[PDB]
């Protein structure tokens, strides 16, 4: 909503309080190919007769919501952050990828209060998915999730050199014999890639074009509750 340009009289709001997220996250906007792969994979799990886009959406529109929620949870349990369900380009509500769209610099007095928490890991965002998967007991399929997460660390398209640099800088040498330190390092890498640094970059890119105050906070980790 901050990115989308609008007529000045019909501005839907004045300020913005974003607690723990940004448009400049790499998983914020999903490309067309990944979205269509997600749709046909969900079609395969629900066993719709995949022939055409209209046919698969007509088949999917009649299934009960519980079945669709269960299938999307099962697919999302072993899928990376780039394979989540997110907004697409659409050409009408949004035009261009968010980093390019932020450089128009046309907004009319939109403030910003943005921040993060030290215990907002992307693994911690999927606690309910893990609890549902352990409720079905699907072999405790967490090494597939961790492998897909580590591959997602290597940019949009999985590249070897960014993967090697990420495995060097944080200490996630692939030692799955002890999952504690490796899992903490994987949370560390995904938190610094998807959450903290895009928030900092968005706060910088909003404060640089001075047409609105920017305030940033950070909550340290709170043990308990």
């Amino acid at each position: 909503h901050l990115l989308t340009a609008r007529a000045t009289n019909s501005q839907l709001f004045r300020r913005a309080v974003l607690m723990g997220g940004s448009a400049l996250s790499p998983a914020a906007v999903i490309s067309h190919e990944r979205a269509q792969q997600q749709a046909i994979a969900l079609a395969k799990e629900v066993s719709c007769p995949m022939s055409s886009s209209q046919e698969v959406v007509s088949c999917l529109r009649q299934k009960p919501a519980n079945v669709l929620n269960d299938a999307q949870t099962k697919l999302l349990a072993v899928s990376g952050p780039f394979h989540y369900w997110g907004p697409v380009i659409d050409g009408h509500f949004l035009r261009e990828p968010p980093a390019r769209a932020l450089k128009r610099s046309l907004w009319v007095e939109v403030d910003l209060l943005i921040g993060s928490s030290q215990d907002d890991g992307l693994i911690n965002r999927a606690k309910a998915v893990k609890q549902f998967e352990e409720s079905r007991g699907r072999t405790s399929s967490k090494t597939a999730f961790y492998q897909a997460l580590q591959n997602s660390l290597g940019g949009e398209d999985s590249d070897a050199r960014v993967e090697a640099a990420a495995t060097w800088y944080y200490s996630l040498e692939h030692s799955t014999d002890d999952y504690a330190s490796f899992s903490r390092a994987l949370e560390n890498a995904t938190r610094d890639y998807f959450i903290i640094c895009p928030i900092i970059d968005m706060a910088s890119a909003w404060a640089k074009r001075a047409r609105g105050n920017v305030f940033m906070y950070h909550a340290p980790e709170n043990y308990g509750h």
Binding site: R161, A164, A165, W168, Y169
Partner: protein, 33 residues
């Protein structure tokens, strides 16, 4: 990996340039290959 330090008190330390030599040994050698 103990080493002496030629200071006034002559103490003992354990890590000499651990981050820098981990960069120059683990990462950049793999990047070289």
């Amino acid at each position: 990996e103990n080493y002496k330090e030629f200071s006034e008190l002559l103490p003992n330390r354990q890590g000499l340039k651990k981050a820098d030599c981990s960069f120059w040994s683990k990462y950049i050698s793999s990047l070289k290959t």
